């Protein structure tokens, strides 16, 4: 099964059809005024009209900022790109800081393409080329459902020859890609010799020929990166690929210009469609003043995605200024370009509901008398700490041969694993020893 993790219980914003929030729904509780606001952002991203518009989620640690940001990615679903990043990712050793911003801004915009995937497979019954030189090659295929003939071009024939295919081999051709794969010799010939180095496979039991409709997702960034440096062209088989190690590089402005111009051609022809997505720059206060200034340009550009920011700082110093304080750790100049959503601390009853939702997500049975105790301990410590104790408590209940958390299990665990507040009290006492 899938591993359980820190946000796997949230399944959406869980708003009603009028846009208002429900008390407890889709794996979130509380926060009505703050998560109704995400509803409006989801409508804005689904509208496709806008570019570069941006949002800041603000509020203390453990109040739900990344949970809400991931809830938005659920409401959009896998049709629309959602690129998460951490502020600290900007400091590469291969490229300038603004290049990392610009790559990630491109990643959040997707081309969506359609094609009919078409596959031929089976034992090769014959190969016959077709004047002076090969015009086409006829090939016959067989499976336990029948036989077909195909008419190959000389490019595909070169690929069959490179795979060392001969009659009696079992082959997979994909007609769109021009992909060709040898899968071994057909086992009807497995007695040609007693020992020979080949691997023999049974004749396929599936259809000779299959069709699907498939959808291809690719972002503008993928086009940039693929087209900038020469594509290596090595299906291995070529030792020149060994010498020049890859590295990232500053993509030039001119190339992004041409890529924009070619993609516009294809969305006029109906071959592709465009999905403006979301970039989630989490941990934003870790950006430098240089980068914060470059955002004033990229958020204005009439191509950019929607950008979501989040921060937990009070009035701290802006990185790289050595001096200047500003709200949320973000420069005032940029803070006047974002709409702000505040995020609020939980009352004890809210934490009880979060704890129960985590318990039944994580797979643990818990008695009411024990759940009231984790509720209390959450008010003394923090929600993110009470939710840690569930699994270790279950694991002691299991060692003592019981199915369900009871008071003495959480009480034992509380004495065995400390909180940052109570550990800091120890460090203040034994001060001279560390």
């Amino acid at each position: 099964t899938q591993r359980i993790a820190s946000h796997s219980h949230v399944k959406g914003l869980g708003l009603d059809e009028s846009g208002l929030a429900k008390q407890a729904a889709s794996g979130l509780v509380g926060q009505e005024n703050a998560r109704e606001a995400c509803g409006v952002i989801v409508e804005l991203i689904k509208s496709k009209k806008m570019a570069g518009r941006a949002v800041l989620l603000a509020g203390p640690p453990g109040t739900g900022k990344t949970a809400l940001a991931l809830a938005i990615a659920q409401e959009l679903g896998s049709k629309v790109p959602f690129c998460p990043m951490v502020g600290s990712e900007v400091y590469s050793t291969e490229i300038k800081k603004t290049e990392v911003l610009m790559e990630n801004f491109r990643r959040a915009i997707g081309l969506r393409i359609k094609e009919t995937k078409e596959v031929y497979e089976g034992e090769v019954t014959e190969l016959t080329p077709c004047g002076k030189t090969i015009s086409h090659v006829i090939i016959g295929l067989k499976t336990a459902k029948g036989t077909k003939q195909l008419k190959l071009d000389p490019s595909i024939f070169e690929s069959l020859q490179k795979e060392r295919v001969e009659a009696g081999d079992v082959i997979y051709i994909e007609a769109n890609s021009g992909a060709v794969k040898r899968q071994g010799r057909c086992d009807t010939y497995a007695t040609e010799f007693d020992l020979e180095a080949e691997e023999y496979v049974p004749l396929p039991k599936g259809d000779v020929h299959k069709k699907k409709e498939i959808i291809q997702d690719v972002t503008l960034h993928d086009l940039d990166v693929a087209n900038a440096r020469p594509q290596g062209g090595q299906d291995i088989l070529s030792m020149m690929g060994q010498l020049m190690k890859p590295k990232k590089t500053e993509i030039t402005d001119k190339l992004r210009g041409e890529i924009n111009k070619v993609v516009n051609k294809y969305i006029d022809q109906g071959i592709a469609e465009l999905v403006p997505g979301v970039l989630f720059v989490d941990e934003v206060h870790m950006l430098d003043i240089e980068c914060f200034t470059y955002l004033h340009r990229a958020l204005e550009s009439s191509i950019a995605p929607i950008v979501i920011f989040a921060s937990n700082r009070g009035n701290c110093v802006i990185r790289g200024t050595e001096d200047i304080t500003s709200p949320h750790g973000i420069p005032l100049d940029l803070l006047d370009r974002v709409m702000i959503i505040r995020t609020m601390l939980y009352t004890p009853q809210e934490m009880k509901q979060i704890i129960k939702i985590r318990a039944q997500t994580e797979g643990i049975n818990i008695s009411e008398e024990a759940l009231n105790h984790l509720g209390e301990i959450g008010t003394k410590t923090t929600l993110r700490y009470s939710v840690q104790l569930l699994t270790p408590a279950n694991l002691l209940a299991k060692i003592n041969g019981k199915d369900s958390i009871e008071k003495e299990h959480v009480e034992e665990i509380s004495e065995l694993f400390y909180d940052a507040k109570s550990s800091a009290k120890i460090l203040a006492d034994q001060q001279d020893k560390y």
Binding site: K142, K145, G146, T147, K148, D207, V208
Partner: protein, 412 residues
């Protein structure tokens, strides 16, 4: 446990069961290699009422020298590989058949006859079979046809022009016969030199090597029972034998053939356990390489004839694949044939496999229904006087008969 076969029935009749209408009621004679099947045409009755004389085509004459015997009872038989090639051992087989059916009296059989022959018959052989028939027995008119094609004629949906492959498998041969517009396309017809005789011979020799302690207990007439009652044809041989490899399947499916009794007596009066053997005997016609023999077998041959036509008439003649004769009686034969056929056709295309209504008797019933219709079509038959100007190497090209060619044999 084994049985023993019956012998010496009581077929005796009056001098001729002549019905109303035309007096010269013909004899219908399936001159088989394993057994002969013979009787009166008996017109005007829809079900053929009495295909009398079901008897093995073998004769006795021993160290005594002075006498011979012919009915179901050291031994001899008149055929070499499904063509008759004996003089008096054919006569005393015909004699038995006529005498038990009744005959008029005078120095000939007064009735015309329809007689089965080999898919191709050597010219000398046809000439001899005509001579040994017109000279000795004095028949007024004669018809030759092929067993398989009579069985097809019987099994057709309608008395109309057709196309198909016939799959046929008798004592010492199997044939694949492509037919178009009612005519055997004998230019590209093919046969395999194996058949149910050779299966029994192989199953004998296997069990002799499995139990040398009692060679004498196992003999052809007991091999017949295990091959008729207890053997089957695989859908795919290398998969069947693979599920036969595990002991828990083996013990549930092996056949316990108790010999007659006089240690629990099996050290000689064994239960002759047949496992894999009950597959390896049927399979000979699909894989003659289980014996020494290098020939294509019923699978590769069908493809090898079917790829020698235009792609439209293939899809025509495969619309009627027909199974008839001897070995097709095995259980599972239709399934193996239609699976093997599915791999060697265009991916979405259609085919049909039909099994004869009674695989062993339909050759005779076919010859009955044919003769009973074509009584007065005097272009179809060879008349007694024609044999005096055409030397016996001569035939009349009706449907369900071998293809004639202009030719003559020197004789003095």
């Amino acid at each position: 446990p084994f049985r023993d076969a019956r012998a010496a029935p009581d077929p005796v009749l009056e001098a001729g069961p002549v019905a109303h209408g035309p007096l010269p009621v013909p004899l219908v004679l399936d001159n088989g290699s394993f057994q002969v099947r013979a009787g009166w045409a008996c017109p005007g009755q829809d079900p053929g009422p009495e295909p009398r004389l079901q008897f093995r085509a073998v004769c006795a004459r021993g160290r005594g020298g002075a006498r011979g015997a012919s009915g179901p009872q050291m031994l001899r038989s008149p055929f070499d590989r499904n063509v008759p090639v004996n003089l008096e051992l054919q006569e005393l087989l015909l004699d038995y058949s006529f005498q038990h059916l009744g005959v008029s009296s005078q120095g000939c059989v007064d009735h015309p006859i329809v007689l089965t022959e080999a898919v191709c018959n050597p010219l000398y052989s046809r000439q001899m079979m005509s001579e040994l028939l017109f000279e000795c027995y004095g028949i007024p008119k004669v018809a030759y046809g092929i067993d398989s094609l009579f069985s097809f004629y019987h099994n057709k949906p309608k008395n109309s022009m057709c196309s198909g492959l016939i799959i046929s498998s008798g004592y010492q041969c199997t044939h694949v016969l492509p037919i178009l517009e009612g005519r055997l396309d004998a230019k590209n017809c093919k046969r395999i030199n194996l058949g149910g005789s050779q299966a029994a011979g192989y199953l004998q020799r296997l069990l002799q090597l499995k139990y040398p302690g009692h060679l004498a207990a196992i003999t052809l007439s007991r091999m017949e029972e295990i091959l008729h009652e207890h053997s089957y044809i695989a859908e795919d041989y290398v998969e069947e034998l693979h599920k036969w490899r595990c002991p828990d399947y083996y013990e549930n499916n092996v056949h316990k053939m108790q010999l007659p009794f006089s240690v629990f007596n099996l050290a000689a009066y064994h239960q002759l356990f047949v496992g894999t053997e009950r597959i390896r005997a049927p399979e000979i016609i699909f894989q003659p390489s289980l014996i020494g023999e290098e020939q294509a077998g019923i699978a590769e041959t069908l493809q090898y004839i079917l790829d020698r036509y235009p792609k439209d008439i293939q899809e025509m003649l495969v619309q009627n694949v027909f199974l008839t004769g001897g070995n097709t009686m095995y259980p599972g034969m239709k399934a193996r044939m239609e699976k093997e056929l599915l791999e060697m056709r265009p991916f979405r295309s259609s085919f049909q496999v039909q099994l004869a209504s009674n695989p062993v008797l339909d050759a005779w019933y076919g010859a009955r229904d044919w003769a009973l219709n074509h009584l007065d079509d005097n272009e179809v038959w060879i008349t007694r006087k024609e044999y005096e100007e055409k030397g016996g190497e001569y035939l009349k090209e009706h449907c369900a008969s071998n293809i004639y060619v202009p030719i003559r044999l020197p004789k003095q």
